[PDB]
Design a protein around this ligand. Structure first.
Ligand SMILES: OC[C@H]1O[C@H](O[C@H]2[C@H](O)[C@@H](O)[C@@H](O[C@H]3[C@H](O)[C@@H](O)[C@@H](O)O[C@@H]3CO)O[C@@H]2CO)[C@H](O)[C@@H](O)[C@@H]1O
Ligand SMILES: [Ca+2]
Ligand SMILES: [Ca+2]
Length: 497
């Protein structure tokens, strides 16, 4: 079974806001795990997310992805580590019940229905390769087979097909993020994809515009590895697709290594570094649809990497400029994109920056869960300061801009310049053509652009400020402030491109 081309077209417009449920908004102070991995209140729940949908929608996002919300049943006598694990949802017991520390089944149904009203898709987190030891049998009487971690395929396939279809039929969720997807063999992903596509076409709901639609059936694999492994374990071969979308970890690293440093300190790369990462998409088969995120619940926050690398701090202007540069790269990236909660306000963990190794789990400070900080949602859990609001407004402008210009979400990309100081892409989709330019240097600069090299015949219009740029002797001259990005509409493209 090939990938569905209608879904691929729809997937390019996904602007996904990721929510780690336990550490997000404590909306019902009567329920919650109260322990976990991270420094948050550990009492996030479905009411908190429900209270946050309007905020999320005004960001410009059109989807939410929740970490697993299914029932992780406590085993009598289990140690404190097993209580913390239960709060993550990643080692569950009952795939067919909502964990009562997060809420009820009725509240889940209310969450999805309300998100659908406000114009948001909903994705759940499917862990189909491992589970807690006390896993509970399915409604149709199935159980997964083999070890708890990993389970055996194909014996466990009937069980996980039942999981994947249950929440689509019951709540009409729009798809699945697929945890540690290399644990499930590619053969089985095709079969689970068939069930999801079938389950999704067998139910409908009314979207925010009155239209009755099927749930999307989106599926995106999490494979924390490089391009050859994402290809081998996730996308599959040319002509023989396994999954159709995986997270773009390689380009995520290029971004933070250009505009900050990664968890290991590799940093201060330039525009050439971004461009080489995008060119490595050639290693994927033609059906592959990578999904670019900047961070997630397993990665240190951008803001803390800036501080870790001694690059910038929230008091300094470069800290905010560098956030905007990275977020602008994402907004220009063709394909689905995902934003981890708090990136839109440059969140960081006060008093933390350097890596903490010894005894880090109990302090909530290991690199793989330190981003699970309590959600600062403006108007709900926090009043933002002027710099946080300025960044959130900018993320809104990017997402609104992206929703309006096909060249950003599904454009063909052609690189114009990639050097130590600037990165300039040409994006074209139908007759929407624009130039994306971002500075990768702390110095101000002027960019010379030959009108013929970018297939431009008329003017360039800054899509955010409105400034017209006119060519003189066949050249545009644009000034770039340090780490400043501009989206320039090619107002009258040439005969071809
Ligand atoms: O004490 C051991 C270990 O516990 C914690 O690790 C857990 C993660 O916090 C938890 O989320 C889950 O990890 C999953 C990832 O989040 C998920 O994105 C996927 O890609 O991989 C994991 C499989 O679900 O489970 C791990 C433990 O297995 C804590 O964060 C660690 O520091 C600690 O070492
Ligand atoms: Ca709560
Ligand atoms: Ca910090």
């Amino acid at each position: 079974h090939m990938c569905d081309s209608a879904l691929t077209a729809q997937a390019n417009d996904l602007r996904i806001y990721q929510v780690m449920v336990e550490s997000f908004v404590n909306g019902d102070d009567a329920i919650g795990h109260g322990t976990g991995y991270g420094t948050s209140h550990h009492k996030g729940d479905l009411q908190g997310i429900i209270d946050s949908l309007d905020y999320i929608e005004s960001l410009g996002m059109n989807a939410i992805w929740l970490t697993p919300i299914f029932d992780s049943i406590p085993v009598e006598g289990q140690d404190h580590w097993a209580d913390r694990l239960d709060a993550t949802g990643y080692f569950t017991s009952n795939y067919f019940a909502v964990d009562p520390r997060f809420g009820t089944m009725e509240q889940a149904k209310e969450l999805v229905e309300k998100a659908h009203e406000k114009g948001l898709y909903v994705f759940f987190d499917g862990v189909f390769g491992h589970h807690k030891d006390n896993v509970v049998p399915s409604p149709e009487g199935r159980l997964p087979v083999g070890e708890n971690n990993p389970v055996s395929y194909p014996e466990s396939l009937a069980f996980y097909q039942e999981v994947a279809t249950f929440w689509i039929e019951e709540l009409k969720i729009d798809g699945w993020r697929l945890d540690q997807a290399y644990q499930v063999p590619t053969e089985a992903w095709t079969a689970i994809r068939a069930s999801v596509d079938e389950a999704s076409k067998s139910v409908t709901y009314v979207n925010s515009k009155g239209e009755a639609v099927n749930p999307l059936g989106y599926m995106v694999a999490q494979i924390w590895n490089n391009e050859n492994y994402i290809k081998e374990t996730g996308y599959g071969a040319e002509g023989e697709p396994a999954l159709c979308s995986a997270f773009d970890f390689p380009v995520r690293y290029r971004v933070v290594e250009t505009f900050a440093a990664n968890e290991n300190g590799i940093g201060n790369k330039g525009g050439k570094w971004l461009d080489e990462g995008m060119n490595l998409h050639r290693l994927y088969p033609s059906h592959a649809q990578p999904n670019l995120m900047l961070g997630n619940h397993d990665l240190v926050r951008f803001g803390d990497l800036l501080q870790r690398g001694n690059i910038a701090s929230p008091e300094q202007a470069e800290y905010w400029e560098r956030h905007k540069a990275a977020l602008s790269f994402q907004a220009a990236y063709s394909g689905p994109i995902t934003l981890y909660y708090g990136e839109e306000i440059g969140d960081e963990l006060e008093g933390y920056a350097q890596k903490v190794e010894q005894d880090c789990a109990v302090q909530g400070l290991c690199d793989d869960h330190v981003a699970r900080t309590s959600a600062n949602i403006d108007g709900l859990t926090v009043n933002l300061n002027e710099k946080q609001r300025d960044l959130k407004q900018y993320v809104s402008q990017l997402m609104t801009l992206r929703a309006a210009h096909p060249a950003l979400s599904r454009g063909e990309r052609t690189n114009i310049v990639a050097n130590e100081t600037v990165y300039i892409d040409h994006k074209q989709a139908d007759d929407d053509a624009l130039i994306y330019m971002v500075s990768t240097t702390a110095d101000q600069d002027t960019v010379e652009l030959k009108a013929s090299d970018i297939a431009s015949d008329g003017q360039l219009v800054d899509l955010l400020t409105g400034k017209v740029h006119s060519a003189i002797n066949g050249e545009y001259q644009i000034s770039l402030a340090p780490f400043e990005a501009k989206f320039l509409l090619i107002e009258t493209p040439s005969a071809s491109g």
